[PDB]
Structure formats: C-alpha cells, structure tokens
Amino acid sequence: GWVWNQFFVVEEYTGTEPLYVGKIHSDSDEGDGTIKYTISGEGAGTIFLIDELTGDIHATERLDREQKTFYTLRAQARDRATNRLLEPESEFIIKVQDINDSEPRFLHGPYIGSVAELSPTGTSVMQVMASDADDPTYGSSARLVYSVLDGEHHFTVDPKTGVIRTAVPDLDRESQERYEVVIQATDMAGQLGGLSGSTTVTIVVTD
C-alpha cells in the first residue's frame, strides 16, 4: 500500500522559532477540543513537542542527517475528559532531509604517484577519490567534479573520475624529478556555491 505515515524535516535548521514538523490528526476530531494528542518514542518530549489540542508538532533543536536519518515515534489520541484512546497508537516516522553541508574530503592522503619520463601526453599517473558525507541519492549535494588550478600546465585531471594524466610529453627526469600538484573536488557538480576540498599530490618522475 501507499506509505503516508511520515513527516519531513530539514536538517541544520537556522531559524529561532521552532520548526514546524506537521500535524497528527484523527478524522474523529470535530474541532471542539475534546481530543488530546500525545506523542512518544525517539525525541519525544525533547526534540519534538506537540500541541495536545491542535496536533501541531514542532522541532525544538536542530537535526543532523549525518548523525541520524529518521526518528520513529508513536501517536496517541486520547479523550481529554477520560484520557482513554480513540485511535490505535500508531507508529510514524520523521524523516530528516539532506542539505549540502558536507565538504568534499580527501581522506586517503598523502597522495603520491609515479610516471615514467618522456611518457606520451595523457598517461594515467594515479587516481584520487574524494568523499562527500551528504546524500548521494537526492540532489547533487554529493556529486563531485575534480579539477586542477588554472596555473597548472604539467598535468590534467578527468573531471568525474579524478584520474591524473600528464599534459606535456617532454618530462625529462634530469631537469626536474618531483612535482607537487594540488587537486580540488567540488560538489553540486561544480556549479557556483558548491563546497570544495583539496589535497596536495606529490608526483615523482622515474627513468
């Protein structure tokens, strides 16, 4: 069947006034105040507070999807005069939504490789893989694009794979044996506003 028992909440909420999660409600509620809505479970009475009359739920402190992706709660509908149930206690999930708040990070450094001297232009040297803690299944918050600096005219980098390639063929080891190239990974598919990380890759020329 269709899945409806859910609420969505943005993570890392910036406002002062509590964030509105939603509203649990019973189709028996005629709108007179005889029903008492109460919640329980993860974050109940701490993170999420409910208005026992209206059913409105609010988040009182910010949420982090990289820490916890969903909260499982239960909802009860009491009679305000007798505190007895008018609806079965029902599980409902609060899904916290991803935002691009995780920068790309090169976690496997120091990155060092080697390539033979006088190699052809386009020779695969090594590969670097940055990581992004955001949600890859929703939006480009974790879709990365690798690049070099504009003032780097010895090597290039594939944009989406991050494999380093030589940009010049006349690399004689005697003139200069060691190069330090910086690589940049940017999320949001490289569009402006995308977060970025960087690493220093040392590449050394062999015979």
Pull the structure tokens for residue 54: 């209206």
User: Do residues 39 and 61 touch, judged by C-beta distance below 8 A?
Assistant: no
| Cβ-based nearer residue to Ca ion, 68 or 153 | 68
Pull the structure tokens for residue 73: 């709660």
Does residue 30 bind a copy of itself (CB under 8 A)?
no
Of positions 13, 26, 38, 167, contacts a copy of itself by CB under 8 A: 26
Does residue 52 bind a copy of itself (CB under 8 A)?
no
Closest distance to a copy of itself from the beta carbon of 14 (Å): 12
Q: Which does 56 bind (CB under 5 to 8 A by kind): Ca ion, a copy of itself, none?
A: a copy of itself
> Which residues contact residue 14 at a Cβ distance below 8 angstroms, ignoring those fewer than 6 apart?
none
User: Do residues 92 and 74 touch, judged by C-beta distance below 8 A?
Assistant: yes
How many CA atoms lie less than 13 Å away from 143 in the CB half-sphere? 8
Contact positions toward a copy of itself, by CB under 8 A?
1-8, 10, 20, 22-28, 54, 56, 75, 77, 87, 90, 92, 95, 97, 137-138
